[PDB]
C-alpha cells in the first residue's frame, strides 16, 4: 500500500524537522508497556521500550491516539507514546485475551449461562478510585533534601544549607533555588473539582491556606517547565513517604549520619537549646533511617562534605546530560 509508506515518510520527516524544537511538557507512566511492539504506531521499529514509572518529554502533537516524545535517558531518541485513550484501549486489550473478564466463569460451565458482559465487565465501572495510567509530573524533578533530623533545627539547617550553597555555586547560571515557605505535603489531584475556588466564600477551606499549597504546586510546575534545575528549601519535609503519592515526585536526597552516637554528640556540640529538642531529633532520625533505601533516589552517607558534594554534582551532571 502506498498510503502507509507515504505516512511513514511524512512522520519520519516531521520527526527529523521537529528534533530541534522546544520541549512542550513531560509525563510519567505507571504501567509496563512497549511502544515498538504495537501495530498501531505510525512508525514501526522506532518505538519506546519503557517500564513502570518512567519519564517522557513531549514536544509536538500527532493525534488523539499517539504523541511524539523522548526519554529522560542519556542519548534517548524520538519515539511515539500511546495516548491516554490509546493506553486505555491497549489496557482493555490486555484484559480481553483471557477466557473471561466478567462474572460468568468458564469452570466447565459452557452453553447454559451465556451472561453477556454487563456494565461491570467494562471500564465504566471500577470508578471508586480510577487511578489514571498517565500523570502530568513536572518537567524537571525537584531536588529536595531530607534528614538527618527535623528541619528548623540547627544541625539540619546547616547540613542542608552547605549543600544548597554548593549547588548554587557549582551550577551558577543554570539553577534556581527558592525557599517554599508554604506547606507542600497536601499536593493532591483528585480531592474535588475545585476545593475553595473563591476566597470570599468564608467556608472551611475558603478561609484555609490550601489554595496557597495548590498555587505553589502550579508555581513549581511552571518553574520546572523552564527546563532549569529546581531545588526546594521547604521546611515541611521529614520523610519521603509524605511526598510519594503526589504528582511532583521530587528527587529525594538523603543526608544520613552513620550512627546515633555521632548525631547526638553533634547535637551536644551546639548547646542547650538543641539539647532541649534532642529527644524529638533522635526520634525523627531513627524513624527516617527505618525508611528503606529504595524509597530515596540518592544517598549521601559520606562523612566528608566534599565527597558528598561531588557525588550530588555527578548525579545532577548525569541528569543534565541525559535531558539534553
Amino acid at each position: 500500500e502506498s498510503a502507509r509508506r507515504e505516512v511513514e515518510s511524512q512522520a519520519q520527516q516531521q520527526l527529523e524537522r521537529a528534533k530541534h524544537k522546544p520541549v512542550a511538557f513531560a509525563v510519567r507512566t505507571n504501567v509496563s508497556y512497549c511502544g515498538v511492539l504495537d501495530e498501531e504506531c505510525p512508525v514501526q521499529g522506532s518505538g519506546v521500550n519503557f517500564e513502570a514509572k518512567d519519564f517522557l518529554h513531549i514536544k509536538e502533537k500527532y493525534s488523539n491516539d499517539w504523541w511524539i516524545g523522548r526519554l529522560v535517558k542519556e542519548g534517548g531518541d524520538i519515539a511515539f507514546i500511546p495516548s491516554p485513550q490509546r493506553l486505555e484501549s491497549i489496557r482493555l486489550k490486555q484484559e480481553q485475551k483471557a477466557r473471561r473478564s466478567g462474572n460468568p466463569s468458564s469452570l466447565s460451565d459452557i452453553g447454559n449461562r451465556r451472561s453477556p458482559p454487563p456494565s461491570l465487565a467494562k471500564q465504566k465501572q471500577k470508578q471508586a478510585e480510577h487511578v489514571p495510567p498517565y500523570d502530568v509530573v513536572p518537567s524537571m524533578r525537584p531536588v529536595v533534601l531530607v534528614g538527618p533530623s527535623l528541619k528548623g533545627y540547627e544541625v539540619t539547617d546547616m547540613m542542608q544549607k552547605a549543600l544548597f550553597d554548593f549547588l548554587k555555586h557549582r551550577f551558577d547560571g543554570r539553577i534556581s533555588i527558592t525557599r517554599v515557605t508554604a506547606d507542600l505535603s497536601l499536593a493532591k489531584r483528585s480531592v474535588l473539582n475545585n476545593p475553595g475556588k473563591r476566597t470570599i466564600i468564608e467556608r472551611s477551606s475558603a478561609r484555609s491556606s490550601i489554595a496557597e499549597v495548590q498555587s505553589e504546586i502550579e508555581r513549581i510546575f511552571e518553574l520546572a517547565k523552564s527546563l532549569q534545575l529546581v531545588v526546594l528549601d521547604a521546611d515541611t519535609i521529614n520523610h519521603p513517604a509524605q511526598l510519594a503519592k503526589t504528582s511532583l515526585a521530587p528527587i529525594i536526597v538523603f543526608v544520613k549520619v552513620s550512627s546515633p552516637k555521632v548525631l547526638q554528640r553533634l547535637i551536644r556540640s551546639r548547646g542547650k537549646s538543641q539539647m532541649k529538642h534532642l529527644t524529638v531529633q533522635m526520634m525523627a532520625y531513627d524513624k527516617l533511617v527505618q525508611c528503606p533505601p529504595e524509597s530515596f533516589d540518592v544517598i549521601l552517607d559520606e562523612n566528608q562534605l566534599e565527597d558528598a558534594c561531588e557525588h550530588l554534582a555527578e548525579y545532577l551532571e548525569v541528569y543534565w546530560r541525559a535531558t539534553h
Binding site: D157, M158, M159, S258, L266
Partner: peptide, 14 residues
Amino acid sequence: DLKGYLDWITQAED
C-alpha cells in the same frame, strides 16, 4: 566521621 560532620555542619547556616 564526627570531625567531618562537625566542621561542615557548622559553617553553612552557622
